[PDB]
Amino acid sequence: ILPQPDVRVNQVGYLPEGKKVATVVCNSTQPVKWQLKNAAGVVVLEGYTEPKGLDKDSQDYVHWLDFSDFATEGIGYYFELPTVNSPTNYSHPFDIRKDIYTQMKYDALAFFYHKRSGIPIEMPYAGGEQWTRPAGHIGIEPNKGDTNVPTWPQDDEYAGIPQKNYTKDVTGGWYDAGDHGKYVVNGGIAVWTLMNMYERAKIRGLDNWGPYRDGGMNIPEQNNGYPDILDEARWEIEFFKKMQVTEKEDPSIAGMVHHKIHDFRWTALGMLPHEDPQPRYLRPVSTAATLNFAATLAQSARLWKDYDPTFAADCLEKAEIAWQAALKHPDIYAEYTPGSGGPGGGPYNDDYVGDEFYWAACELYVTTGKDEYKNYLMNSPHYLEMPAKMGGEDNGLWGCFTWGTTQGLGTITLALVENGLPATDIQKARNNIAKAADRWLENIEEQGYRLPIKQAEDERGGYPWGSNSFILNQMIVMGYAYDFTGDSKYLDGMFDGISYLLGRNAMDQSYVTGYGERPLQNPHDRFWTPQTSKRFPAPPPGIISGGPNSRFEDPTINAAVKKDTPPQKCFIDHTDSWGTNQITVNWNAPFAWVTAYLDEQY
Numbered sequence: 001i002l003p004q005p006d007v008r009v010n011q012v013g014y015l016p017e018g019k020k021v022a023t024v025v026c027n028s029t030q031p032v033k034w035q036l037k038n039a040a041g042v043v044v045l046e047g048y049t050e051p052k053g054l055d056k057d058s059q060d061y062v063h064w065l066d067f068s069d070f071a072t073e074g075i076g077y078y079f080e081l082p083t084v085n086s087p088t089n090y091s092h093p094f095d096i097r098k099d100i101y102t103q104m105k106y107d108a109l110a111f112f113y114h115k116r117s118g119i120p121i122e123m124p125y126a127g128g129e130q131w132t133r134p135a136g137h138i139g140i141e142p143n144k145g146d147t148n149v150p151t152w153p154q155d156d157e158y159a160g161i162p163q164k165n166y167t168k169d170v171t172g173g174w175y176d177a178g179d180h181g182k183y184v185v186n187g188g189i190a191v192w193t194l195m196n197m198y199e200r201a202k203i204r205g206l207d208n209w210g211p212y213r214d215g216g217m218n219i220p221e222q223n224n225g226y227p228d229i230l231d232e233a234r235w236e237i238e239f240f241k242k243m244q245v246t247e248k249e250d251p252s253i254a255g256m257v258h259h260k261i262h263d264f265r266w267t268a269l270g271m272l273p274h275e276d277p278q279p280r281y282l283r284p285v286s287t288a289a290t291l292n293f294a295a296t297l298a299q300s301a302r303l304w305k306d307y308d309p310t311f312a313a314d315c316l317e318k319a320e321i322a323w324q325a326a327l328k329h330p331d332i333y334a335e336y337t338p339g340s341g342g343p344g345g346g347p348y349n350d351d352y353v354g355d356e357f358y359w360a361a362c363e364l365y366v367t368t369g370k371d372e373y374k375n376y377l378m379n380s381p382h383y384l385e386m387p388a389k390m391g392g393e394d395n396g397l398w399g400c401f402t403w404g405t406t407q408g409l410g411t412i413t414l415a416l417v418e419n420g421l422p423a424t425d426i427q428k429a430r431n432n433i434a435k436a437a438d439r440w441l442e443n444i445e446e447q448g449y450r451l452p453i454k455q456a457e458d459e460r461g462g463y464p465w466g467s468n469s470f471i472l473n474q475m476i477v478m479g480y481a482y483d484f485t486g487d488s489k490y491l492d493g494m495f496d497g498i499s500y501l502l503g504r505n506a507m508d509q510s511y512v513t514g515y516g517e518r519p520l521q522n523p524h525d526r527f528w529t530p531q532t533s534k535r536f537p538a539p540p541p542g543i544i545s546g547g548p549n550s551r552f553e554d555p556t557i558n559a560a561v562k563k564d565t566p567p568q569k570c571f572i573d574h575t576d577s578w579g580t581n582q583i584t585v586n587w588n589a590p591f592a593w594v595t596a597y598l599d600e601q602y
């Protein structure tokens, strides 16, 4: 077992240039001496600590150890505190080189090939023989799904609103997380995040770099003429298309998009996609899913126009058919359902879709330039909006957006792409984004472990489900700020956010698989779960954990830690802790956006 260094640092390392502040565990409030040592032991730098006191989220007495000035490349740098009488008066070995996120950006996007449904996971692409597996859900027993998935049984206690009895082929798409579900909601932001990082590379001019080019990713679409990152994105878009309801299926709601499709009931950990024996069904349909659809398909329409005109055009034509249907049924909300004992997939419920509408409008406007999308876009409560603090479940949480609080996603599209909105408004939008980043930049300075989020305002406070993802989305908006201003403070903010995710935290935990001295090793996943049975393999690298969640929303974290544990410590790296150690598409997408960004800024 690993001791836990008194000096918390990024367990992998730092880019030679930029803000660098470790966090020490020192009740000894009074500047204590430190000293950066190279692998050999020689003190290549030194100074004193900065007493910050009792940190509210971690219940730790801490000091900051700013060493931003230092920028000398090398392997094995480890801090120390000669005066301190602690058996752990130090930091894990780390690096200061240019290629910290060079490989990590690919690993992160590889997560999406791995979670692909309806296709075999084969060698080269898998990165290892042990991650190979049969296609998941292609109608071959024991699977009972996706080629002919019927609508949810009506007599079911959680059947949701009534549906007609029919079947669809909804093969393909990505698995959401540790489960075998496929959700349009949550899938929407995930896929928007990959296409957006691409569009950003294009407009800036580096779309001919890394994963943005044909042959940039170790996926089967390596040299098919299209940009690799979009091939992945299209995999999910192809699945969205199949989820849209047709005239022959149900006239009352044609053009609308089924909320999600998954197992009738929950299966246990320790299973591969093709082994899932559960009956498979289609959830009801929801304005939000219809709008995520309209939005990502519009975005897809303008990005694929140069490569595959036929595909790009059908995307747009479907996006509009969905936007239109959403106006006629603007208030069908996916309702809540238990997390255990009920439907075999998460609910992703939301009773507010104004933002979604705003989002779809922003994407449709920039793509079609039509008046109707412009009039909505502008006369909206969310016009040019960009939260720093949201506010159903997201109210008072801290962060710019989530799978359910979508305004902001659209706003980013307005602040980065063509469109003929008064150049004046575009300016506000870009300012709001920088404002938003400033607030978070503050949170970091008042935070002991320099993380951009503070506990929730929802009175219960603490860190929410998948907190880490909030830090991630924040880093994206920050990233744009450094684009619109050039003020390296926004970049240093990112440097703090990611440092937290990689080890400078109250758990001395690297929430990313395959990275750090204490890497994330037991995510809640049905395939990569060594703890369930040695039969299954440790997971691939570059996948991030949801992190701390002080709502004790799973048995394991309930039995593993006291009832009063500090929010930033409410975590356990155990495959059973689904509320604290799970992996998803809406978390690895933003984690990828961010790792890519940090690799270019270098």
Ligand SMILES: OC[C@H]1O[C@@H](O[C@H]2[C@H](O)[C@@H](O)[C@H](O[C@H]3[C@H](O)[C@@H](O)[C@H](O[C@H]4[C@H](O)[C@@H](O)[C@@H](O)O[C@@H]4CO)O[C@@H]3CO)O[C@@H]2CO)[C@H](O)[C@@H](O)[C@@H]1O
Residues within 6 Å of the ligand: 177, 178, 179, 266, 267, 268, 269, 338, 339, 340, 341, 345, 346, 347, 348, 393, 465, 466, 546, 576, 578, 582, 583, 584
């Ligand atoms: O508060 C809502 C929260 O949802 C987050 O998304 C969740 C998604 O909604 C949920 O479907 C899934 O978490 C699943 C987990 O994958 C699944 O394996 C597990 O199933 C258990 C079962 O409950 C047990 O009874 C027993 O049978 O074992 C199985 C397998 O271990 O159930 C959980 C949910 O109950 O993952 C998504 C990602 O976290 C949103 O991200 C968040 O923002 C929302 O607040």
Ligand SMILES: [Ca+2]
Residues within 6 Å of the ligand: 213, 214, 215, 221, 222, 223, 224, 225, 226, 227, 228, 231
């Ligand atoms: Ca390609």
Ligand SMILES: [Ca+2]
Residues within 6 Å of the ligand: 288, 350, 352, 353, 354, 355, 356, 404, 405, 406
């Ligand atoms: Ca919403």
